[PDB]
Design a protein around this motif. Structure first.
Motif, PDB file in Angstrom:
ATOM      1  N   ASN A   1      -5.945  -0.322   1.917  1.00  0.00           N
ATOM      2  CA  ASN A   1      -5.109   0.266   0.876  1.00  0.00           C
ATOM      3  C   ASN A   1      -5.891   1.300   0.063  1.00  0.00           C
ATOM      4  O   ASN A   1      -5.539   2.489   0.022  1.00  0.00           O
TER       5      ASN A   1
ATOM      6  N   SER B   1       0.853  -1.178   0.000  1.00  0.00           N
ATOM      7  CA  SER B   1       0.000   0.000   0.000  1.00  0.00           C
ATOM      8  C   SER B   1       0.894   1.235   0.000  1.00  0.00           C
ATOM      9  O   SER B   1       1.656   1.441   0.954  1.00  0.00           O
ATOM     10  N   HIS B   2       0.797   2.048  -1.059  1.00  0.00           N
ATOM     11  CA  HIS B   2       1.630   3.251  -1.212  1.00  0.00           C
ATOM     12  C   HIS B   2       1.096   4.402  -0.368  1.00  0.00           C
ATOM     13  O   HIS B   2       0.096   5.043  -0.736  1.00  0.00           O
TER      14      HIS B   2
HETATM   15 MG   LIG Z   1      -2.692   2.440  -2.508  1.00  0.00          MG
END
Ligand SMILES: [Mg+2]
Ligand SMILES: [Mg+2]
Ligand SMILES: [Zn+2]
Ligand SMILES: [Zn+2]
Ligand SMILES: [Zn+2]
Ligand SMILES: [Zn+2]
Lengths: 162, 162
Positions: A118, A96-97
């Motif tokens: 996320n 998850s960024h």
């Molecule tokens: Mg993400």
DNA sequence: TTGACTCTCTTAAGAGAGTCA
DNA sequence: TTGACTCTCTTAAGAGAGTCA
């Protein structure tokens, strides 16, 4: 199976290689009208990407290492989390960024959580705007805001009540 | 169909049929520790569903009418918005459940917005917890909360900064 | 053992269209 | 004409695996 030591070695080689990616400074909204700075380590737009890396989709990559004659391959953002549980509450864990920058592979910009958690970060007000994520957001989500709704709730007659 | 009159007649027939769906009361979180009451008009679980309605997926339905001897068919929640633009900023407009209840067809629980806006309501804190949607939410999103993140951002070496 | 490509799949918010009776 | 089924598709956050040299 790969031993704990071998997995640590994979993570270390991944960090070595990603640390040499171009580092791009981005100014970002934090929520509450404040601005902050994130430093993303961005995989190149085209080959070569770096030792062990290859593109399997427009914004998808994999990391590959061969150990004792066996090829092992992982999603390129999953490598920091190879020593962690891979599911929670019956849901698969996903990379998850926190920086919302897909090409970034900075492990300080990644967390490991369900796909619902996320996705939800896209709309978070941010660490200075009311974020309640236990693992705190690094920035306000890119989709946070009033939205652009074309038409709201409405009826022509009197058949309904809210 | 093509004429504004024909479209109004479709909306009016749809409203009359959905108005006879069972009305189910749902008590819902609003945010801020408050609770509210919504009245959902729920399509039946199995056939028959109502005049003009048929199930095309586990939680997908379509509304169908014969106009000028031609069958016209729409997604069952899209009918209230047939006079609205079908795109916004180059994104397809979607029927969006403010009540987070798929079977519900109450048009007072629907809006018409991009899929991103639609999805984002799942994590909204709600009308008494800080919702900033210009078309306001009816309830706190079902996925709002701290999340269940398994691992946060981390590095083994010293190559990265936030 | 490695690089640079190829392919399809998952999820959960949403869609369109065809086959029969 | 209307009803009750069947199938695949879209999006944007994410995945696994094959081929060739
Ligand atoms: Mg993400
Ligand atoms: Mg929705
Ligand atoms: Zn980043
Ligand atoms: Zn957050
Ligand atoms: Zn409802
Ligand atoms: Zn809202």
């Amino acid at each position: 199976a790969l031993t704990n030591a071998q997995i640590l070695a994979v993570i270390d080689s991944w960090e070595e290689t990603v640390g040499q990616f171009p580092v791009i400074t981005h100014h970002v909204p934090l929520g509450g009208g404040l601005q902050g700075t994130l430093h993303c380590y961005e995989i190149p737009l085209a080959a070569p990407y770096g030792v062990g890396f290859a593109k399997n989709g427009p914004t998808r990559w994999q990391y590959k290492r061969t150990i004792n004659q066996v090829v092992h391959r992982w999603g390129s953002h999953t490598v920091p989390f190879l020593l962690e549980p891979d599911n929670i509450n019956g849901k698969t864990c996903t990379a998850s960024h926190l920086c919302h920058n897909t090409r970034c592979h900075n492990p300080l910009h990644l967390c490991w959580e369900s796909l619902d958690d996320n996705k939800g970060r896209n709309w978070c007000p941010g660490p200075n705007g009311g974020c309640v994520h236990a693992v705190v957001c690094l920035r306000q989500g890119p989709l946070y805001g009033p939205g652009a709704t074309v038409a709201g709730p409405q009826q022509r007659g009197s058949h309904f009540v809210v």
